[PDB]
Structures are given as C-alpha cells and as structure tokens.
Design a binder for this molecule. Structure first.
Ligand SMILES: C[C@H]1c2cccc(O)c2C(=O)C2=C(O)[C@]3(O)C(=O)C(C(N)=O)=C(O)[C@@H](N(C)C)[C@@H]3[C@@H](O)[C@@H]21
Ligand SMILES: C[C@H]1c2cccc(O)c2C(=O)C2=C(O)[C@]3(O)C(=O)C(C(N)=O)=C(O)[C@@H](N(C)C)[C@@H]3[C@@H](O)[C@@H]21
Lengths: 586, 157, 582, 152
C-alpha cells in the first residue's frame, strides 16, 4: 500500500544546517531531474551536519528502478558537492522499510565503552550478518574505531604550530606510497634482481601517531605529535549515546532482503549469532531490545533549545529507572538512545525503546501496553524542563490527522516563512471547533554563535583566511584527515580539539594562527562575535523552502473538512507563501 | 515569586511574541529580568523579534533596559541592528545607553549603519550617540558607510 | 524507433578541438561493455559543448541503456577536466524533437528578456524537469549568475590579475563549517550547545563589491568594485527569445523515450498551474508550440562566423513574414536566437509557429502543408542563410558518414569530403543536394606563449593561461545564494576589453619579482583556420553528408553510386551509412 | 646450493641436513646476498641455525646491503637465535651500510630481552648510525620507559 520511497543521506562533519542546505541539499535537489514516476520530494538539513532527501514515487513503481535512477543522478552530481561530503559517502537506499529485527550488543563486565563495542560489532559481526541468507541492508549502531587526535591549543601555541601543521604532518607521515621496483620492465637485458620497493606504510597504533615529527627546534629538540595532542582509538562520531538498561551498548539494525521469508531469516540470524558467541571476548552478550498487545513501545524525550547531551542523558536515565522499578513486573528492557528522536536530531533529543515481558505473563488490563504507557506519560509529566511521552507507535500512526506543507514560493527567506507559519498557526488556534493540535513538525530557531572574520585585519597581519577557517573548523568541528590500518583493517583518522578547549566562547581566544612572518596571532586579533538566532533544522519540499505542519480534525469533524479549513486560512497568508498536501493527505 | 519556572516561560512568551502569556506571567510575579543561557532577557528577545508592545509592557514592570548578554550586547543593539525603529525610540526614552559597547566595542550606531537603517541612525544621533566611536578594529560608523558604499548614510554622518 | 541516449557536457571558454581532445575522446574511449549499442556519434563545438548520442538496437529497454551509459560515464568522470565535472554532465533518454514549448512573457513589460529567463530558470525549470515523462528541458535563456566584469586597466593599476580576483572570491564568498559550542564529545557539566556560524555565501552585488583584494602599503583598501563592475547576469548570453516580437523566455520540453505524450503534457500543465498564482505582476504563460498539425518550425542557419546581431536580423524577417504576410493564418511566433534545430551557436536560430484554429483557416491553401512551402519559397530569397519551414512530431533521402580510418586528421578529411562532394555534383541525374551536415572551418586567433620569455621575466605560465582564459572565456569561480537559491559566480572581462586583437596587449600578469608584464611582452599571434564543430562516428573523426536520389531514381540506386564514389577516395578514408540509411 | 636456500627458509630440518651430508655449500647466496643462515634467522628456525653453524656457516655473512644474520634475529625478536649466533662469534657491533647495529634494531622493536643479551656480549651502547642516533635516542623517541633505563 505504502508508496515506494528512496532516501539520500549525506554528512558534512561540523557543518550547520544552513551550510548543509546551501552546499549539499540544494545542489542535489537541483539534479533530481529525468527520474520517472516521482510524486514529490522532501528534505531536511540539520545542525548535526546531516541531510536526508526523501523521494516518494507513485504506487506500483519498481523500487529497484527508482533507487537506481536516483543514485545515478546523484553520482553525476557528486563533483558539485564539497570534498568533505564526498569523503563521508552519500548513500541512496530504499526506505519505508522498518527493521526485521534489532540486535543489541552489551558487555556484562562493564569493561567496554560503546565505542569499544561498536568496533567489535563492525569488525567481527556485521559482515557475517549481512552475508546471512535473507539479510538485506544492515545498519551499525555506531562506527568502527577512528584514530582520534585531540589537539591542545596551549601546546600548539608554545611551539608556534596550528592545526594546519598537524594535518600536514599527518598526511606526510601516515602515508602509503607507490615506490616502484628494482629491475622492473623494461629492464636492462640480463637483469636478475626484480624486487618491489617498499617506502612509507600507514601507521597502525596510537604510539606510531604519537611520534609523528611536527618540527625540530633550532636548539635540537623535537616536537612530536604526542607533545601537542592526546591520541586514542575512539569513535568517528560522538552525537549518539546508546544504553541498554543503563549499560553501554551498540548493535545492528537488520532489514529483510526483497522477496525473502521473514521468520526463516530471523532464525538464520539467530543461528549465525549462536556461532559467534564462543568467540566473543569476556562479557560481550547479545540482547534483543525490540521483538516487534505488541509487547513493545517507545518513549519520546525532548529538552529545551540549547540543552546539552549530558542533560538529555539525565532525563533518559530517569526514564530507564522508572521502567525498571515502577514497571519491573512488565518491562524487560529499555534501550535508550541519546541524540535523535522523531522531531529530528541534536543533543536535546532522545528516544527510549521498551520491550515488555511475554504478553501471556502480563495478566490484567493494567499490565497491557496502553495502560502502561498512560501511567508512564502521567508520571513523566512531573519531570521539569523536558517533554517526555510514552506511546505504542502502531497505535499512534493508525487516520484522523492531516499533513500540510507551507512553501516559500518567491524567495522570501526563512525568517519571513517563519512569520507566515506563525500567522497560520495563530489562526488555526482560533477554530478549535474544527482543528486541534495544529503544530509544526520541525524545530524552532535557536541561539547560535556568529563569528565574523575581519578580512582587513587578517591581511594587515599576514594571516591567511584559509589557515583561519581551517584552524576554526578542524579544532571545533573536527576533520577527517586520512586513513590508517587498525589490526589489518582500514579505518579513519580524525583531528579535533580536546573537549576542554572548544566548549565556550572564551575558548576561541585560546587558538592561535601563524602569520606569514612567523608570529602567532590570537583569534581575538582578527575576529568578533555576537549571538543571533538561526535554524537548527531547515526543511524543503519539492525543491523549495518549506515548513511542515501536522494537525488533527476536531471531534465530530471530517478529515476533509479540516483540510478545507486549512486551505482557507492559508489563502490569506502573505504574498509569495504557498502550500501543498503531502503524505497521508496527498 | 514562586521558584524559577515562570521566568523561563516569560522568555519563551516574549520570544514567541505572545502579549497574552506575557502579561499573565508578570501578573503572577515572573522574573522580568530572567535570563537564558546566552544571557538574553525578555527585553532582548522582544527587541530582537520586533515585538513593540511586549517591549512596552516589560519596561513598565521594571525590566532592566541596559541588561547585556554574555557577549556585552544590549536590547538597543538588537533593536538598532534589525531595523525596529519604534522599539529603538521607546528603549532610548526609557534610558537605554545610546553609547553601549559590546565585547567587540560595537555600538548601536555601528550596527544600524552597517545594515543601512537611516531612520534609526538619526534617532541614535538625536539621543547623543558618539559619531567617532570606534570598535576593536578602529572603524567608525563613517568607515562602515564608506565600505558599504552608502553615500546617503555617509552624508548624514 | 531505436532509442537514443544523449550525453551532454560543457567546458566554458573551450574551443571545439579542446572539447574534443579533453572530453569527447575520453568519454568515447570508456563507453565499452554496454549492451545493444548500434552506433555512437558526437559533436564538439566551439561554444564549449559536447553532445554524444548513443543509439541502441530496436527493442532495447531505454531504462537499461541509460543506466549502463550513466555507470560507464561515472567511472570516466575522474578523467575529465575539473572545469567540465563542476558544470555537471547530463545523460538523457528522450526524443530529439520538442513535445511542447512553454513560453513566458511579461504583459506589463516590467521585466527584460534576462529578468524573465532567470525567473523561469530559478522558479519553474526544476519542477518541470522533475515531471514524469519529461526527458529533456531546454531553457530559451540563461539563469542569472553573479557576474564580475573585470577591468584590465584598474587591475594593472593596483598590480592585480584575474588570479588574484578568483583567489579572493573563493576566500571571501565561502560557506564555513565551524563546529559547535559544547560540541560532542563534551566536557562534563557543559550547559550550552550552539552552532558556530562563520562565513556564509554572499547574496548580493553589494557584498561582492566589498570583497577586499588588497591593502596598499599606505593603508588604503582595494575592493573588488574598484577593479570590476558587479551585476547579476546570465551564465551565458547566447540564447535570447521573442514572442510576437516581445521579450520572452521559455522551456523547450522533449518527451522521454517511451512516455505518453498526452499524459506528459497534462502533467506539465498541472505543474504550471501550481506556479501561476505566485508569478510576479505581469508575468504570463503562453503556449506557442503544442504538438492538420496546427504548428510547425522554421530553422535559421547562417554561415559559421556570423554574430548574434546578424542572426537576429534574419530572425526578424522570418518573424515579420509570419506576422504580416500570414496574418490571417498565424496565431503566434516564438523565435529563439542562438539555438538551432541541430546544436547551439551565435549563427543559428529557430522559430516555432502556431496557427490559428483549423476552422478559421478554410481552404487547402491555408493548411499547414501549403503554408510551410509558401514560407520556404519566400525565405529561399534570403542571402547567406539557410531558412526553411518544416514539421516534426513529438516522437528523407540518405545519411552518409565519411570516416577517418588511419589518423589522417581534420584537414585531410575535409579534402576527401570536398573531393567526394565535387564528384557527386557531376552526377545530377542520380544525386541531388549532396551537402555536408556540419560547419566549415573559420578564422581563429592563434596566440603563442613564448616559454623562454615568460621564464626569463619570472611570469608563471599558469598565471598567463588563467589570465587569458578568465578574461576572454570566463571562469566559473564558485557558488552564491541569489534570493535563497544556489547559483554560479563568473569572472570575465567587461565586453569592451575583449573585442579586438589589440585588446590582448592591455592585460598584465604579475611576475615573481612583483612587476606587471603585458601580454605583448611574452606572446605573438596570427590568424589561422580551424573547426567550429568537430564530428565523430563510432569513435573516429567523421563528417556527415546528406543527400537524396534524383527525380525518377530509387534511394538504393543513389546509395549505390555514393558507395562507388567513396571507393575512389584517398587512402585511409572509409564510410558508413547511419540514421535513415541504416 | 639453491635447494638449501629453499630448505633453510621453509623450515624443514630433515632436508637441510641431507644437503650438507651431500656437501651443499653452507655459504650459498641468493640474488640479494642472503645465506641459509640469513633465511633461518629471519623466519626463526633455531634448529637450522644450529646445524648450519655446525657445518661451518659464516656467522658474519653480509648481504648486498651489509646486513648479517644477527641483524635479522635481533630485529624480529628471536632470542634463542641471537644467543646461538653470539656464542658462535657474531660481531655484536656489526654495522650495515646505514650504520645500523643489532642493538638499534632490537631497541626499536622493544625486544628488551635481546637488548640485555646484546649488551652482555659487549654491544657499544653509544653506537650511532648515519643519522647519529643511538639506542637511547630510539627508546626516547618510542617512549619505551623500561628499555630507556636499561641503557642508563
Ligand atoms: C535505530 C533503531 C533502533 C535502535 C536500537 C533499538 C531499537 O529498538 C531501535 C528501533 O526499534 C528503531 C525504530 O523502531 C525506528 O522507528 C525505525 O525502525 C525507523 C526506520 N527503520 O525507519 C526509524 O525511522 C527510526 N525512527 C526515526 C524513530 C527508529 C530507529 O531509529 C530505531
Ligand atoms: C544510526 C546511528 C545510530 C542509531 C541507533 C543507535 C546508535 O547507537 C547509533 C549510532 O551510534 C550511530 C553512530 O554513532 C554513527 O557513527 C553516527 O552518529 C553517524 C553520524 N552522526 O553521522 C554516522 O555517520 C554513522 N556511521 C555509520 C558511522 C553512525 C550512525 O549510523 C549510527
């Protein structure tokens, strides 16, 4: 029944929502031509540097054909995208297919972080799982290790070095070079020796990265990378924190291959997991946090704007604690995910996946999914400075609401589109007899730190703007430099400031850039900053700026009557503001 | 006063321009000078988003007209920067520092001149804005006009 | 009909040989391993454009053919110049003829031709291009770019070059990823999380005008507006259209291979209905070409070398004839200068003619067939321009290819072509109108950089060729945001400094020692002849030749003579039948 | 003597002793100048190292770049083989074309057990290579605290 959909996903590490939209999203959307059977296209670009573009096709469209046509158009547009985006990979996959099952991985010994667990799943479990019969796509809940170079601006200023020098040295000294052969063809006739020449090879350990030579002081002393940075194996990304009943977790999201049997594949996965368990290191255990009443439900967590990951974790821990105590008789597991929810991603969002005991062992109406989620939601209404909501998602997705798109049709811009949305939402509230819960599906503008580089001061001091923007980006956003070999497996190398030097506006002053003459110049010499509001999540519909609006028809009114009202209110919005229906309302 | 929950709701009310919740909240003793994480008061938010009436009701209930955020910016900075002429006047009428400098030495005159708000530049000068005020880079409002190529603003200055 | 997949790419400022030798040959050499390919043909133009047509066997799935071509082109993309990759290459499976033309005018006359073209490109083209069944969309106009029109006198005065301008634009029209306050992984107890915003794309001519090029040693500032005029203007200026003499733009829409012509047109009309309520004041959609027929086309081809101004004069007389002599039969004329029935160039044009209702054109002399032939006869008295009117549905003599089989080269292939053309003229009883389908060589300006003098002065040859190409050909620098939409930024000489050979000497390049060196100090130039359009067939240099059997003679008989005529051609010259003759 | 080069490499003790019982050259070399003693010390075949030295193998044989079988054994952590070579008269201070001694190769790989045996046999702790580096500089550059103090 559901129309086929293809989703394009891309990543710009360290980029804001506007940067993502204007260098990636718009460029990709402008190249989505010549594709058959397209109904509509929608996208969002957010402050985690992520863009998703969903293309929805007419019913009966071959999803394989749709995916191939979309991916081919995307690949021809690949040279138009930033290098940092190309290096992360831009995936094009059939969507609107939930997981066949979710496999969680924990360590009962408490000796492994979630990064340690994710790297074990990536290097020892995921590939054999994806080769299991009936298995289609497999998503890793985390990443394999990356070599993390955590920079110290105080040490770098001491030896007159910048992150530019660190990145240059790593590219030069973590390198794998083609070096030719002795006696290669064409040779001198009579040659006997034929041997490959081996020069530099990729580094393999924190120790080898630590002795990368940055500079030799003129008094004879050496500055090694370990003198300006802490070096450890870690994650490629730290936006998501996963816990299973409070313990660190990773895992796999497994999708069923097209035309394969669901339960046959589920048994094959479990049988493959049974093979691996003898080889697990001590403590590693497989769990199943969501055996899809239904026996499972979700809990939403949303914190105010600007709220940090640590604050979201506190609320999620309270949610986990409530279910494992106040519902210890009904709940078997809570899988808490800090970093995304339904309304988008970010440090102030989270979602908990709750699996219940067997329905047979939960007698009574009070121990069923609906009654459990009502007590939970009522108990969580106490929690201050957080919106916490429990629900069974099949029960909530199931026929009374509409899906509205407000569209900028004349280049008005985000601020003027926000005003038009506010005017429509204010009017929708004036008709409670017909429209209830008319709300934006997206996020509101939040404060952001706007730093202006003074071009005249940088040129007068001899400071390159590219050194300035590389220093700022690499230290505060992080940078994928190149690859290394971890126990025989190729993995990524990331440079970024140690956390304590990239937390607050005053930390901007700790960072120095080297000028043409050799002096170290602080950021305060050529920059100024102020607070301003901006979007953490920009939306587009059919290639134009948009804002999605959800709502319900009032009790005693039809879905068509409610839509009719919305159209009437929309007709009196400012000039250049249009609308369209999508999803359930298309 | 209660605890600290009404202050946060006054910030969101003034940010979202709801004259309704704002007067109900201060009738219940909400902290009129409650600040958010970046140090913005309800007067900051109302001046930024151009809600003239909320600026008025806030000021008569004792809102600090010269409060500064964590980077030294006052509500007059915001109002002058984004061209809210009516708010600029009521702020100056209520004693807003016309020569307030933020952490960068940027004055309301610099911000108004940069975005070409001629009417606001005139109002600021009327209340005694220093025409020769320099920011951290030595630039005056006249230098800003020259760099932007705005000769009508340059003529006033 | 056998399905055809078309590859298109563009190289701003490149000549035909440059396009052929850095793009066309590279793509052709990597079109291997594709199923059911009948033949392959290509044009490389001095507009900087390449079009490669891959024709497949009848019954081939057009979806499969397109995907296989796209995948092979993807693997060859790293072999193409970066300047070509960044323009975007297109691969399409559409008919060669237009299904319909969507015309856009401003009834209030408050928008120029270029204003209308940008509106169409920025607000209409993309949604039409995504409509199912639309195989190709031609914009009869150009989208706005941010145009930096450089002045070589002021650049020299401040000892700057186009290299300095390009470097400053990339540095100061940038979109910076700068991370977050309290970003992950954070310290414990962190309370604030916020995006850091650094530089963002410029959005206006004023912002580009204050790009800071240099600070003089006394302290004064040299801004970009001090060495250039800054304005919105088309990415190129080669295509201008008119609707009944009035300024216009529009979209030429071609039907995707296998799509339904009627269903596709209705979907296009429904998409246009969504856009109309948001048009600016005065903007109106007209429909000048909807596929008796009720419509027809007229093509205009001037000799290679003709300017846009001279082609416009010929289009004016074509339009004038339909608007006066055929008053009672013609509803509208949509004329496009710079776009031709085959290809693109300053010396070609096309006019789409729409007839009044069939009921209002009674009589056999007022039907499409009688009108088009009367027009062809009237236009046959036009001097130095091929002009004729014809028909073409949304979905004949012979078609002959002369092929360079032994690396003979362009000059020798031209000579063999002329030798065969003169022999066919000596058989008027069998062959008629044996002519080349392509273009003739034209004078080009050959400039030679003296490597010794450049090195002796310390002038980098990269600075020289960048200065030459950016000034006289234009250079795509990077992107900006125009009213919320990503568009291009171009630098190029202002028109009056790139018109005449003497202007070459007004451009200066900075040497290593900081001295400015004029182009005359390290270059010399002469006139020579070269091709404005190079053709290839199945990967080899080629020249298409058209012709027809004489009256009272069969097509197979005419083809028999052409084969015998070709067998007596110089060594290494082959041939092949294509198209209708395949 | 090629079959013995192959035999000393693949680690087949029985074949090897057939070859000197048949008189194969104990000092045969391949194109890179590696004797069977080199091959046995590289892949760590102790028994063949003992047998070859028993049949008069050159304990100080050089390859085309001046490396001895002691260099290979010290480099790749073969403590049993560095002992057997040093008791048979391996130049503990042997330099290759780059001035690299077995103490350098042992210190770089952190083979502290082999470093002690090398020192015990008279290894010059202050020996430099062409770049002037000693075994102590290697320990400092690698961060090996224990190895650093064994060289004082
Ligand atoms: C990562 C998934 C997960 C991880 C660990 C334990 C779990 O129980 C899950 C899920 O069940 C998820 C879903 O059910 C999704 O709804 C889910 O399956 C899904 C999907 N396949 O489209 C989503 O779109 C997600 N939605 C936005 C909330 C969500 C998944 O993110 C998670
Ligand atoms: C889907 C994410 C997820 C879902 C549910 C539970 C989880 O614990 C996660 C993650 O931790 C992910 C990451 O950490 C990513 O590294 C992650 O966060 C991420 C990103 N933010 O760009 C990626 O690039 C991902 N990639 C595989 C390295 C990866 C994510 O795919 C997952």
């Amino acid at each position: 029944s559901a129309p086929p959909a293809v989703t394009i996903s891309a990543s710009y590490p360290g980029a804001d929502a506007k940067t993502v939209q204007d260098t990636v999203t718009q460029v990709i959307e402008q190249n989505m031509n010549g594709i058959d059977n397209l109904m509509y296209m929608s996208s969002n670009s957010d402050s985690t540097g992520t863009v998703q573009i969903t293309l929805t096709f007419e019913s009966g469209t071959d999803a394989d054909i749709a995916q191939v046509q979309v991916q081919n158009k995307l690949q021809l547009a690949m040279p138009l995208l930033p290098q940092e985006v190309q290096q992360q990979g831009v995936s094009v996959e059939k969507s609107s297919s939930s997981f066949l099952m979710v496999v969680g991985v924990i360590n009962t010994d408490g000796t492994m972080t979630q990064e340690d667990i994710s790297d074990y799943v990536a290097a020892n479990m995921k590939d054999a799982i994806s080769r299991t019969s009936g298995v289609g796509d497999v998503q890793l809940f985390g990443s394999q290790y990356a070599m993390r170079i955590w920079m110290n601006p105080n040490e770098l200023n001491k030896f007159q070095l910048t992150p530019v020098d660190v990145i240059t040295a790593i590219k030069a000294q973590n390198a794998q070079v083609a070096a030719g052969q002795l006696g290669g063809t064409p040779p001198v006739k009579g040659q006997q020796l034929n041997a490959s020449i081996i020069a530099q090879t990729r580094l393999t350990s924190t120790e080898e990265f630590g002795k990368i030579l940055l500079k030799v002081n003129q008094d004879g002393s050496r500055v090694l990378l370990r003198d300006v940075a802490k070096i450890e194996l870690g994650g490629e990304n730290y936006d998501i924190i996963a816990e299973f009943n409070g313990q660190p977790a990773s895992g796999l999201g497994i999708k069923l291959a097209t035309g394969a049997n669901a339960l046959d594949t589920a048994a094959a996965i479990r049988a493959e997991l049974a093979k691996m368990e003898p080889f697990f290191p001590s403590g590693l255990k497989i769990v199943y946090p969501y055996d899809t009443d239904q026996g499972v439900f979700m809990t939403m967590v949303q914190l105010p704007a600007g709220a940090t990951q640590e604050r979201t974790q506190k609320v999620l821990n309270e949610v986990t604690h409530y279910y494992l105590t106040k519902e210890k008789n009904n709940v078997e597991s809570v899988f808490a995910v800090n970093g995304f929810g339904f309304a988008g991603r970010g440090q102030n969002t989270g979602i908990a996946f709750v699996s219940l005991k067997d329905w047979a062992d939960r007698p009574g109406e009070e121990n069923k999914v609906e009654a459990i989620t009502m007590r939970a939601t009522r108990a969580f209404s106490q929690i201050k400075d957080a919106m916490v909501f429990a629900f069974n998602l099949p029960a909530i997705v199931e026929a009374t609401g509409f899906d509205f798109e407000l569209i900028d049709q004349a280049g008005l811009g985000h601020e003027k589109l926000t005003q038009a949305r506010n005017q429509l939402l204010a009017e929708a509230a004036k008709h409670p007899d017909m429209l209830t819960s008319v709300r934006p599906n997206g996020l509101e503008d939040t404060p952001q730190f706007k730093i202006d580089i003074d071009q005249e001061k940088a040129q007068a001091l001899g400071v390159s703007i590219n050194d300035i923007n590389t220093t700022l980006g690499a230290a505060w956003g992080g940078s994928y430099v190149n690859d290394f070999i971890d126990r025989g497996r190729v993995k990524k190398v990331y440079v970024m400031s140690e956390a304590k030097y990239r937390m607050l506006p005053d930390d901007i002053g700790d960072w120095y850039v080297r000028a043409a003459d050799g002096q170290m110049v602080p950021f305060s010499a050529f920059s100024s900053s102020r607070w301003e509001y901006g979007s953490p999540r920009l939306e587009r519909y059919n290639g134009l700026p948009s804002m999605e609006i959800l709502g319900q028809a009032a009790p005693g009114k039809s879905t068509g009557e409610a839509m009719e009202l919305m159209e009437q209110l929309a007709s009196k919005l400012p000039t250049g503001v249009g609308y369209d229906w999508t999803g359930m309302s298309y | 006063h209660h605890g600290s929950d009404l202050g946060k709701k006054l910030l969101e009310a003034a940010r979202a321009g709801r004259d309704d919740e704002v007067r109900i909240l201060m009738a219940n003793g909400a902290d009129v000078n409650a600040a958010d994480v970046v140090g913005w008061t309800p007067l900051h938010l109302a001046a930024y988003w151009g809600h003239l009436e909320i600026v008025e009701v806030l000021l008569k209930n004792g809102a600090d007209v010269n409060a500064y955020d964590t980077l030294g910016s006052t509500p007059l900075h915001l109002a002058a920067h984004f061209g809210h002429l009516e708010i600029v006047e009521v702020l100056l009428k209520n004693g807003a520092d016309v020569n307030a400098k933020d952490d960068n030495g940027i004055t309301p005159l610099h911000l108004a001149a940069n975005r070409g708000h001629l009417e606001i530049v005139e109002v600021l000068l009327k209340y005694g804005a220093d025409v020769n005020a320099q920011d951290k880079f030595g630039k005056t409002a006249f230098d800003i006009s020259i760099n932007n190529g705005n000769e009508d603003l340059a003529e006033i200055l």
